[PDB]
Amino acid sequence: KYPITADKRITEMVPERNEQGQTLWSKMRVMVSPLAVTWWNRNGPMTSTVHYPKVYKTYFEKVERLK
Amino acid sequence: QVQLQESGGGMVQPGGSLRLSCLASGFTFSNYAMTWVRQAPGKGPEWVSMVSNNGADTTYTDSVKGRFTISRDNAKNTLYLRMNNVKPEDSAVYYCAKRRYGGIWTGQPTDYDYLGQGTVT
Amino acid sequence: MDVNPTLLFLKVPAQNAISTTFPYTGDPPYSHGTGTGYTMDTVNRTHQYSEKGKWTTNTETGAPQLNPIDGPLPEDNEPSGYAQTDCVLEAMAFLEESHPGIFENSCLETMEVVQQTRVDRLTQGRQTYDWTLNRNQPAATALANTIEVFRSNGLTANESGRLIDFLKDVMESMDKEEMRVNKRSYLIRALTLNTMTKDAERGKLKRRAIATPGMQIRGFVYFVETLARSICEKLEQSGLPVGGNEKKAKLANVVRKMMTNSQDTELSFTITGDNTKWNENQNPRMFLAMITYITKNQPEWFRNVLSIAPIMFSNKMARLGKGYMFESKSMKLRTQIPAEMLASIDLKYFNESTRKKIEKIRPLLIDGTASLSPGMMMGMFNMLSTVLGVSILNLGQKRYTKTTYWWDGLQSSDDFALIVNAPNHEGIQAGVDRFYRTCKLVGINMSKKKSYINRTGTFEFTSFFYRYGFVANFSMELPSFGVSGINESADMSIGVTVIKNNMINNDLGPATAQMALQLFIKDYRYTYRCHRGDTQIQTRRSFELKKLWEQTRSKAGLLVSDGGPNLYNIRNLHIPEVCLKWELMDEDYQGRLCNPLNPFVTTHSWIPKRN
Amino acid sequence: EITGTMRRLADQSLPPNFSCLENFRAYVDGFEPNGYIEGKLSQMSKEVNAKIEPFLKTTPRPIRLPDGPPCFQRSKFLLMDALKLSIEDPSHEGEGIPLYDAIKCMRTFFGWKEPYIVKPHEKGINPNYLLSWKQVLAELQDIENEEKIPRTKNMKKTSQLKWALGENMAPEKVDFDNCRDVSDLKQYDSDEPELRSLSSWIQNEFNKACELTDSTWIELDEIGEDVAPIEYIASMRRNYFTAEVSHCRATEYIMKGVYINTALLNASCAAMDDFQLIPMISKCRTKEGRRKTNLYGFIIKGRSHLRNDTDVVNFVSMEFSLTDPRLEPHKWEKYCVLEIGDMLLRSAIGQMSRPMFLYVRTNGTSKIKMKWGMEMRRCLLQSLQQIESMIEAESSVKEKDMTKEFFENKSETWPIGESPKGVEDGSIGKVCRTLLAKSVFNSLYASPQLEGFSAESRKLLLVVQALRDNLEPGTFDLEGLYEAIEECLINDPWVLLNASWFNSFLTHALR
Amino acid sequence: IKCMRTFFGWKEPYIVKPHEKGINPNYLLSWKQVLAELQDIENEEKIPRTK
RNA sequence: AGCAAAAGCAGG
């Protein structure tokens, strides 16, 4: 377990265990679990910013050529 | 013209099996995805399964996983559904329908065409 | 009842069903044992090929070097690397006469590239031979090694950043008598070339023993191969630098150009095959002569800095490898014997075939490493050899064969495909015997065993089999179709990009490529455990997937590593995944994804803990 | 910045006629062609010339297979005679550490007689392998009944297993000076091995291995929808393909091999110093039920420290068997067959009650062969690639471009069978199966003999197609092809059978 | 464990009934300890028969 | 004993 590595900053945002109790991160930075990711994507800050298509909007243009 | 005539249904005993067939004619079959949608007497319909054009992307309801197996044969332009371990609550009238688009997930499960028949156990 | 796939191969056309004779769907055999025996046999074979040629010892080396050129004409059809430089020069002369201005233009391209080039490019190689540890090592460590030893030396070109000054100062300190290594030992150590048995040689029984060069010669071969790439790009008969479907069309185009039979009162055959002993019967002397002729009327310094490669080809002392591992039968004990002492040991512990090989080579051993230069180094991507051999095909312009019959075609590094014409079987036999003779007079040996000949329409070349108009190809086998092993964000991307490259370049049909993507996503999920949300399979993770999968608003619009479906197919492979999903996703998920608050930066991306 | 010493080396590198770099450069720069080539040609011996010949219809003699002892099997797991103790369709949420699924399946079967050997090995020591199997059964019952459920079990060191893997068989590295005094030493017994003769057993194994098993053996998921044309053509081709392939026994061997090799590589990279038990376990979905974990056979992995990937790892393998030995004792000179009593098979009438024997052979594979046996899904894919290449060729020669023209029609168009005084024809189904199984055996009996044969049979068959279509082919030296083929036919049965197939092909084609 | 593994639908624990005596949060954290202990033993230990 | 081959493993 614990394939993923990441900083200590994540420790504040999310718990050490989920509802079932299986762990997201543990110390010997902290090792983080892949479950930790899928916990972010269920509950996390929602923000309607469109800055990240700064350059990712390029690929949409290539798809408009297809469809 | 587009018509969907289904068959293979009948009476069975609880915990058995059934093989529902649906023959479609009048349109380009290999292009559109297909759906099984059932309706129990008294309750509005509920979608049973959605199957792709390739027959590779399949999706079932949250209460029928492991018991059902949906498939299709493009030669005779036909749709097969294998129901195993029939629970008493699956006792409803089953419906074969042809999706609006060729997709499965694009849009919520709703159809725009006709229907055949369905048996009850 | 008995069964056979050979009879489906009976009826079916051979070239279309040829892949059935492509059994490479399993691990290649490899060489468990030290290649040194195969090396000794290769050296024995090439020195036997040039035994008529005289040799004289090189100064400061102690080593016999054989010069086959200006040797006699061969006696027997058995191959032998005997050639005459005049043939080479008149060949290149007819070439430039045929293709005017091509030489000077490629030369100017070489000038501008050497002026613009930089040392930073060469270090991105694989297993250049280092001289300190006396073992093949990576190229970055190699560059660090040479620049630090040069910092110790009196030269200062590693600080310059340019490259030709770097090669020049390599040469200057290479002429030094001490570094902690004397001049003779150092010149034997710089010219040394690891033996390093071939691995993955598909389609043989015994092993070729590909030997590899070091970094110091690598830049010289880089420059001359850049010239070769330019001149072959401006050529129409090369096969190596031309590639992909353009190469596929070039094959068909040359057979078009020569198969058109105006006044077809003459029968026509079109050879294919494989020129055996390509890396043996050739020679660097012919290469140096070619080089001198190619850069006519140019800056003298360029002439020199591009002639330096064939000369150090012309004297090279490759190693032999590890050695052997003798063993006691009764007492049952074994040891490795480094062959550096092989020029001292008795000739009784060994095997008899091995023994006779040793006595053949034991004279030819100086510092233990075998010396030889009648023959090319095994397995280099030279392609100036194609520039050579294609001139032969150019001789069969009817102006210059000066007879009724005439040849033409194309020729990559080992394969070759002539196309001839003559009024009868007798005339074609006459002209092809003339060609085979000529091709030997330049020191190129067309084998008579594993080659053949036929009417036009069907001919092999470089495995791009060409039946009448069909151009099936089996150049390289499909590789792996498995994850790259980095992260759920880019592994998928890497796999799709690899699939796209191998369908666009090679002949991965889409019918197999969808299935390849299918196996790939299966492996992706089974590795990262992350099957579909709407499933019934269990694992560690599946809790959160079955949680988020209902948590969503748009269900199919999800990335695959978290419960999502794979909307890829052969239409939309170059694009990434989240571009295809983005506006099919709701702002909660999309906002959770692209956010600098993630430690992940692309939130699926990350670094795994080292192990 | 030549420094002259390079001019020295250069002037020494040149041909003998010219002694300097500068005279060479002046000669070349001042060079012109004067028709030297014709003087060279006329000067030459006429002996040195490549003479064509008519590669006539009656010329190519039947390639003579080598003669010697009978060919013997070397597969890492037997192929036709094996059987599988089912699990009877467990649930869908219950994962299983594989030992417990195996144990459950071994627990299912009763019919264990006392072990007594049925085949004399003729070498080694048969009783020791008997007692090895005994240790296995005892260890398994003892761990599971009365310990804290260990996920993975490694056996106990004994005379039996330690003999059958030879942890003492290693000699030790030493310096040269201390042993040069000894005269017993030899470089190595590096020589050709014993010849072998073709026999009938491998043909039977292949025939069984092309045949349809009953189950499905492989699933396949969904992919993005299909809009463009080429997408639909790819979809239909792959669907036809996988549906035809899935009911193979070749695909059974495929998943079996993949799981076996993955398990072994996991173990060896993760565990070296310990004799491990592993099952030959494979996951198969029943056509009409649930997922089924079949137990083919146990494994006793031998210790594995892989300083290089090329290195061999040795082990012992136990795969159950119904069919008796001594019907084909040539097929194995290597097995060590035990008796393990009866299994009560049920036929349409009565009950068979045939005995049960076990083939506790030993072996050793590799790291590399394990990797390439893990990647046999590629081999399946490669069979698809070949079929698609055939069909694209038929689409280029005929613009119909019709996959459906061949994939499903009832049309006898493909011969793969040779019968007494007959040739059988089959459909694309049998042929896709056969091409697959050929590639699988290529993946199992991969050996340089095969690659040599492949190149040489390829060239000669190409020449024979050139002949049969009246394309006036020629070959300069032919007995070279024949002797090199005979060189590559050393011992491998699969090679040998491809050669007998080549032979009968020559005969029935008549070229 | 297999049956508890079957069910999904676990929200965060917050008490719904005031005990009016004792300490409700402590029983909440007891239940938390239970779930955590069960997942932790079964995922990453040598399968103890009784915990 | 075995693997597999014109040389190596069978632990360092």
Swiss-Prot record, chain A:
Taxonomic lineage from the root? Viruses, Riboviria, Orthornavirae, Negarnaviricota, Polyploviricotina
Q: Which residues of the full protein are shown?
A: 54 to 126 of 759
Compartment list? Virion; Host nucleus; Host mitochondrion
Q: Which family does it belong to?
A: Belongs to the influenza viruses PB2 family.
Question: What is this protein called in UniProt?
Answer: Polymerase basic protein 2
> What does the protein in this record do?
Plays an essential role in transcription initiation and cap-stealing mechanism, in which cellular capped pre-mRNAs are used to generate primers for viral transcription. Recognizes and binds the 7-methylguanosine-containing cap of the target pre-RNA which is subsequently cleaved after 10-13 nucleotides by the viral protein PA. Plays a role in the initiation of the viral genome replication and modulates the activity of the ribonucleoprotein (RNP) complex.
> What superkingdom heads the lineage?
Viruses
| Subunit structure comment from the entry | Influenza RNA polymerase is composed of three subunits: PB1, PB2 and PA. Interacts (via N-terminus) with PB1 (via C-terminus). Interacts with nucleoprotein NP (via N-terminus). Interacts (via N-terminus) with host MAVS (via N-terminus); this interaction inhibits host innate immune response.
- Chain's gene name: PB2
From Swiss-Prot, chain C:
Tell me what reaction this enzyme catalyses: RNA(n) + a ribonucleoside 5'-triphosphate = RNA(n+1) + diphosphate
Instruction: Tell me a Gene Ontology molecular-function term this record carries.
Output: RNA-directed RNA polymerase activity
Instruction: Give the family from UniProt.
Output: Belongs to the influenza viruses polymerase PB1 family.
The record ties this protein, via Pfam families, to: Flu_PB1
Q: Which domain of life is it from?
A: Viruses
User: This protein is called what?
Assistant: RNA-directed RNA polymerase catalytic subunit
Recorded name of the encoding gene: PB1
Assembly information from the UniProt record:
Influenza RNA polymerase is composed of three subunits: PB1, PB2 and PA. Interacts (via N-terminus) with PA (via C-terminus). Interacts (via C-terminus) with PB2 (via N-terminus); this interaction is essential for transcription initiation.
Supply the source organism for this entry: Influenza A virus (strain A/Northern Territory/60/1968 H3N2)
Query: Known EC number(s)?
Result: 2.7.7.48
Q: Which UniProt keywords apply?
A: Eukaryotic host gene expression shutoff by virus, Eukaryotic host transcription shutoff by virus, Host cytoplasm, Host gene expression shutoff by virus, Host nucleus, Host-virus interaction, Inhibition of host RNA polymerase II by virus, Nucleotide-binding, Nucleotidyltransferase, Phosphoprotein, RNA-directed RNA polymerase, Transferase, Viral RNA replication, Viral transcription
UniProtKB/Swiss-Prot annotation, chain E:
Which organism does this record belong to? Influenza A virus (strain A/Northern Territory/60/1968 H3N2)
Q: What is this protein called?
A: Polymerase acidic protein
Q: How does it assemble?
A: Influenza RNA polymerase is composed of three subunits: PB1, PB2 and PA. Interacts (via C-terminus) with PB1 (via N-terminus).
Annotated gene: PA
**What kind of modification does the protein receive after translation?**
Phosphorylated on serines and threonines by host kinases, including human casein kinase II.
Quote the function comment for this protein: Plays an essential role in viral RNA transcription and replication by forming the heterotrimeric polymerase complex together with PB1 and PB2 subunits. The complex transcribes viral mRNAs by using a unique mechanism called cap-snatching. It consists in the hijacking and cleavage of host capped pre-mRNAs. These short capped RNAs are then used as primers for viral mRNAs. The PB2 subunit is responsible for the binding of the 5' cap of cellular pre-mRNAs which are subsequently cleaved after 10-13 nucleotides by the PA subunit that carries the endonuclease activity.
Give the domain of life.
Viruses
Q: Where in the cell is it found?
A: Host cytoplasm; Host nucleus
Regarding protein family, the annotation reads: Belongs to the influenza viruses PA family.
